[PDB]
C-alpha cells in the first residue's frame, strides 16, 4: 500500500522487537528497515543508533512512500533517551521528500528535488538544539540549510523529554517561490517559510514520508562510542491535497 494518511502510536504492541513486516504492515510500506534498531518500548518505537558508525551502518534511514500531492503535513511525539549521548549531531523524526529527495552532499540546485527533514546539532561552544534541515532549490550550501533556526532559540533541548512535533510542507510551482516548509515543535514556530522545491514541475510532488534516525554528518566525528536510544510516538501523516 501507499498511504496517503496514517496514525500509528503503538499502543497495540507489546514491549520488544519491532520486525521489517511491522513496519511495513502499519506504514505500508519501509524499504530500508533494520528490524535490530526497532523495538517497541512501553508503546513508543525505540530506535537505536550503535556506537562507532554513521548512516545506515548504525541507525534506521527509510523512506515511505506516500501518495504524491502538493501540500502534506505529519505530526509525531520525539524524546531521547535519559542518557542519550548528543555528540556531535544527526537525523530524526519524520519528514518529506520532493522530487529526486535530494540529501547527502547533492543541493537542490539542479531543481529536481529536495528533502524537509530535522535535525539535532551540538555547537563547538555546547548548546545542543533541533534545528531544519532542508534541501531545496535555493540552498545556500551544497549541504541542508538550517535557515539559521533553532529550537529552542536560545539554551538547550534536555534528555528525557518529549517534544511535539509538526511539519508542513508544500510544493511550489515553476521557478516561482511559492512553496512552504514549516516545523512547529511543542506549539513554537521553528521555521515557517515560503520557498522554492523544484525548478521542474515533473518533480514538484511531495513523493515520500522520510524516517531518517542517524548520526551524521558524513565524517567519524558525527559518531558517538556509546549506543544511544530516541522514542517516537502518536505519528499522524496526512495528504491534505494534490493540485496539478
Ligand atoms: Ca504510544
Known sequence: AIPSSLSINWNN?????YS???AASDFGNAGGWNQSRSYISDGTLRVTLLKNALSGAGGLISNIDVSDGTEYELDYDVRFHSQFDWSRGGKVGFGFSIGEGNTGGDPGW???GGTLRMMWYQT???????QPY??????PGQYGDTFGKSYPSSGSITKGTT???????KSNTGSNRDGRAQI??????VLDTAIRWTTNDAQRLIKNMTFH???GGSQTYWQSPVDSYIYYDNLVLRKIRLEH
Do not use: E, P
Not at 504492541?13 to 522487537?17: P, S
Not at 532542508?134 to 540552498?139: F, G, P
Open 13 to 17: 504492541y507489546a514491549t520488544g522487537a
Open 20 to 22: 521489517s513486516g511491522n
Open 110 to 112: 539542479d531543481g529536481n
Open 124 to 130: 563547538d561552544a555546547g548548546r545542543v538544539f533541533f
Open 134 to 139: 532542508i534541501y531545496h532549490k535555493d540552498q
Open 163 to 169: 517534544y511535539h512535533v509538526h511539519v508542513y510542507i
Open 184 to 189: 512547529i515543535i511543542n506549539g513554537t514556530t
Open 213 to 215: 534516525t542517524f548520526r
